[PDB]
Amino acid sequence: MRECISIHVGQAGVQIGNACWELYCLEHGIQPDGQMPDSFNTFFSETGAGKHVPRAVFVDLEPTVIDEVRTGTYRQLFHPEQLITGKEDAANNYARGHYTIGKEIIDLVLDRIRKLADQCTGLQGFLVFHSFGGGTGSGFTSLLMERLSVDYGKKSKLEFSIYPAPQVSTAVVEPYNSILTTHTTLEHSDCAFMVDNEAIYDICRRNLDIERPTYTNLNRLISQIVSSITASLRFDGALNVDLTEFQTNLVPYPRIHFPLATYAPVISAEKAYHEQLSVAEITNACFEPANQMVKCDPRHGKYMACCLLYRGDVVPKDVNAAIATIKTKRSIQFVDWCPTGFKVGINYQPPTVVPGGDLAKVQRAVCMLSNTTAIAEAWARLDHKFDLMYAKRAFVHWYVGEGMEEGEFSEAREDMAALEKDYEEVGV
Amino acid sequence: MRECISIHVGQAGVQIGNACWELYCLEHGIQPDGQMPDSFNTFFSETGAGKHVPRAVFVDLEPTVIDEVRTGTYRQLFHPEQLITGKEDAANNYARGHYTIGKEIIDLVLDRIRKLADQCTGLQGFLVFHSFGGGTGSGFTSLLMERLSVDYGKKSKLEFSIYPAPQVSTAVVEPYNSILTTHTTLEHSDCAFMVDNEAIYDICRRNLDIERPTYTNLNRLISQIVSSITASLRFDGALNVDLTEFQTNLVPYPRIHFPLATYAPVISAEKAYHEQLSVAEITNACFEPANQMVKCDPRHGKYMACCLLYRGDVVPKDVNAAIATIKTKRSIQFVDWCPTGFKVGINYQPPTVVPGGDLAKVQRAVCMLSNTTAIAEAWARLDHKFDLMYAKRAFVHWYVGEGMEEGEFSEAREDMAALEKDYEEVGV
Amino acid sequence: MREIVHIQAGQCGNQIGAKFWEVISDEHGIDPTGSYHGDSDLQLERINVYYNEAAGNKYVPRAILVDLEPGTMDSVRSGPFGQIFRPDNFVFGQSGAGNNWAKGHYTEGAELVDSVLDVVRKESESCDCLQGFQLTHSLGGGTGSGMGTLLISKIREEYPDRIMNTFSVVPSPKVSDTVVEPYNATLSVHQLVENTDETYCIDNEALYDICFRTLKLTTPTYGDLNHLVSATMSGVTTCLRFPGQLNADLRKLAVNMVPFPRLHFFMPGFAPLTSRGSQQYRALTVPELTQQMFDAKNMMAACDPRHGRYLTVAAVFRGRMSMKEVDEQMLNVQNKNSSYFVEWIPNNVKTAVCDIPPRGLKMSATFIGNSTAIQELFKRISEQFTAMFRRKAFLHWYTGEGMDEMEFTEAESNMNDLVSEYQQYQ
């Protein structure tokens, strides 16, 4: 009755969407053939006789990553005119993904978005998974968001962006892409949650006792976060939220829309036997800085808004008791102009466990979305690296040979300076 | 509903804790799996469905002693985050435990103490097990007592310390560590019970008729004494004490808090068949010098406070008659400023026997604690040893190369001279 | 029409109050669940002094239980006759006193006394017209002395025109049970000279001596001593509950006993206490009860009553007896040994007779004496105090909680003023 269209662009989007759709087809008992041997209408569409096609569009510029989805275990599932592919990749070059390569695929993917948005009645918003450092995951994401904000007006539009780690890095033309993308998407998205690779590496080392995690464990954790967001829409609870609540509750001014996400409890199968995981314990474990999924410290800033999403066997009285005993501690400090700084949601259906994974079975689980002023410090680091690679005009000719003049870098630097000034203003 | 947190530091504290948790699991019927087929609440925390985990923290700087606990038959008992280790031992160097190596651990063990003490509602005090003659057992104990007296304020903090013997010794630099830790812990502990190795060797030689005792027999006797101290909390009795009363009865002046402990009746199964063990017999027999578990002469000093803890099948009338006929004899003489010098506690549950052990089945049991002026003489012996190894500056460079000046030794010997003058002052 | 509420504070007061409610509920004939099953009619017409009607002929006591650790509360609740009380009357803390007077009066009692006084005020609002209160405690520890003292003072500032009794066991001469015992005794007596109407003094040693020389027991527990104390309490208040030929309630005993308002420390006793072997070798006559009352080794406090003189004596007899015999024998035992009685008071003895005896006795008697030789007890507290107060021993545990040394010198001067007033009249 109320629906959502999920778009995955780029390699990071395709792999996070692989883990997410595996989790979704496991939660509602659906086989990879599409048949289940009714709430799933918020994500699926019934095709004739016991066949469910999902509402997903997978788009990419390189035909190597999608053609492993078309021959994996989910060959039967997605519709063949939804997995759109290009011919040549962006080559970590935002000028290729915005101007030259991306503009022969955008009309076809917008026709598929228009066709999937006519099979609904109560369309609530889109969900776009993408990275920051990559080529198509920045340029094609910003072009897609610009066209969606022109065409679809005042509907919701959330995001999932991969935040670049401070010390750990793969590319070298990365902060160019980050500053250009954050300048261009600053006027079209509605909210955008952040996750960092290095914090999830440290989490899987310290908590889950995994010494060598590959990308499957990281994508499983990201999928757990998206599942905890949308499980207030897929089931019924005592105190429930939907997708148009978050933009009203977490974004005070229309350019501060980067909250960071946290999950709890993340423990192994061994240390779960020796622990009682009540609501006060997991509420306190959400708030200690060794468990954040972005490598920054909330002690170096003040909270502007906090939103908790609970699942399982929780009663609201000790939820209120736990938030009460959180609000007295001095370790945690909230901002002055916001005395009511919480938004509470409680759902009934517990989280399930994907077999072959690394998580254990728990009854209760929390997902936190926090909008804090610590993330300004992270912006500082990225800004500084830009200046170094703009001090000597390094790698600029690759971008200016593909349809971008030199002043765009100055514009992006000025807008990131303005954003750091806005954060400093509302914080200090 | 009222609890205690026990911390074990160093090898001697870890092994005494091994015997103590073996005995405490044997008393209340809990198997080493942590499942029994509610008094144990004062020591064990219930975890979900029939699992009781202990309230203990094990910490050492060398990983060869905790690993036997992590692999031996109590593998399934403790929480695996409560068995903390390092990488390099203190090497009998007080400066390596207090200053250099011992500071990479203390934030972790303070976090574990803070995370265990938030699950309590009636927390009554701590119990720290350590020796004197060693490196981490003196340095890490002093630094931990500093942090606990700063953080946790007015709660009672007890210690169980191995006192160095007159003749039997292992290390060569023992009196240095003893003088330094006695200077440092004198301002944060509330009561520290002293036990000796040589007197337990003579008790096992003469009473039990064991001619070659290992460390296991000594740790069984120490566990019996600590169990008799805490049985006033784990059970229900006619005239019962708790953990806060001991300091108010045994500590007249706030720097005389070194009492010595005794247990009775300690016999074999061969002499147990030929004597009736009346309450008057065990009350007169805990007051003889050949049973006192510190190698000293109680006839050469006058008593200041006594505390008797009875367990099993006793009635109060012959208890008071036995104390009355104690105070009529001439050799057992009390001090002038204290006409009332006895504190009595009586419990119901008899002492349990460990299988394969050495103690006999008996119904009545006495624990005695005594605060007397004999132990000043023992202090004098230690100071004389210090003086000889301070006439030639022997072994000092190992200390001063790790972060301790040459002023601390003169300071600590000054405070030992002050404490000797205090004992002689209140005596004469 | 005259109702009494009951407050028990401490460990010793909790045990004695538990045995008291077992004895009283056996005497009036109700089950451990609270249902009435009596065989007479007189067991229910004057039941309003201790119990409340509740919803289908169940009667609950008018008792209030307070302690600083939950151990004795849960031990009293789990035992027999534990389902009688109302569960809102169990008030407790979590901390514990540690046998400090100061930790009971100043540190934890200040947080518990609000809830205790709210329950006392509600039970006092529910009653019609009360006679007074009573409290059971001990003068040797920290919960009993400190918080019973605090509650006594608050109740006197709220209800100043009632009679407030206290049944308090005191420290023993030969052998103690706490090292800081005379400190607690001196400060608590310094408050109880002022703020109470009468106080009954019980020893643990004289109870052991009655249990050894007269009752000829081999193994006495604490249950037997708390039964003796409860027998004396019920014998004191029996004239309120049953009709008698010559009757006397609490205020009558107040008016008769204390000549000057600070001399309200008595010594009680019970009769007949016989063995199981020599039970069938004696009679049941009033001369045997009277000679067993005025006897030195029967007194429940370790003071030799022939070391001074008697001020006033009260005697409460129970059963069906003859008043000529009673009054002739009080005359006989008063002119027999005249040196032990005050010269300037004629006919020292006060007499009362109730009809219905204890459960299982043909006849009984209760003795209450107000004598001068109790000064000996007070002497042996004060000198002990001065020994420790000549050296400031054990003092910093009290001084760390909020007291000064001037309070200790004030309390010693108060107790020596009381010994002076006792030596005045002999």
Ligand SMILES: CC(=O)O[C@H]1[C@H]2[C@H]([C@@H]3[C@@H](O)[C@@H]4[C@H]([C@H](C)C[C@]5(O)OC(=O)[C@@](C)(O)[C@]45C)[C@@]3(C)[C@H]1OC(C)=O)[C@@H](O)C(=O)[C@H]1C[C@@H]3O[C@@H]3[C@H](OC(C)=O)[C@]21C
């Ligand atoms: C002296 C005597 O026989 O008294 C017994 C009690 C009875 C005591 C009984 O309760 C015994 C007590 C024992 C001496 C001690 C006892 O085992 O421990 C307790 O807690 C007692 C006092 O309740 C126990 C269970 C007994 C035997 C005795 O209580 C005492 C000695 O304090 C008591 O239950 C009665 O019913 C009394 C009724 C008649 O008055 C007589 C007797 O009491 C007296 C003092 O005269 C009783 C038969």
Ligand SMILES: Nc1nc2c(ncn2[C@@H]2O[C@H](COP(=O)(O)CP(=O)(O)OP(=O)(O)O)[C@@H](O)[C@H]2O)c(=O)[nH]1
């Ligand atoms: N007649 C009884 N006297 C008792 C009993 N238990 C203890 N005592 C007496 O109490 C004294 C020991 O301390 P107290 O109980 O008086 C002080 P209390 O325990 O009430 O306070 P806390 O320090 O808060 O525990 C000592 O004189 C004992 O003889 C009992 O069951 N009966």
Ligand SMILES: Nc1nc2c(ncn2[C@@H]2O[C@H](COP(=O)(O)OP(=O)(O)OP(=O)(O)O)[C@@H](O)[C@H]2O)c(=O)[nH]1
């Ligand atoms: N958390 C997570 N990060 C990934 C994953 N795959 C790639 N990344 C990160 O994505 C960034 C690289 O940019 P990509 O998104 O891979 O580039 P692209 O989308 O394939 O587009 P092209 O430039 O055409 O290759 C790096 O920071 C990677 O660490 C993944 O599976 N999980």
Ligand SMILES: Nc1nc2c(ncn2[C@@H]2O[C@H](COP(=O)(O)OP(=O)(O)OP(=O)(O)O)[C@@H](O)[C@H]2O)c(=O)[nH]1
């Ligand atoms: N009763 C008893 N005494 C012990 C035991 N182990 C060592 N001791 C005594 O402790 C002293 C030796 O110093 P240790 O306590 O072993 O030093 P440590 O605590 O291990 O600290 P490190 O120097 O880091 O190894 C000697 O007096 C021993 O008699 C034991 O297991 N039981």
Ligand SMILES: [Mg+2]
């Ligand atoms: Mg690619």
Ligand SMILES: [Mg+2]
């Ligand atoms: Mg070692």
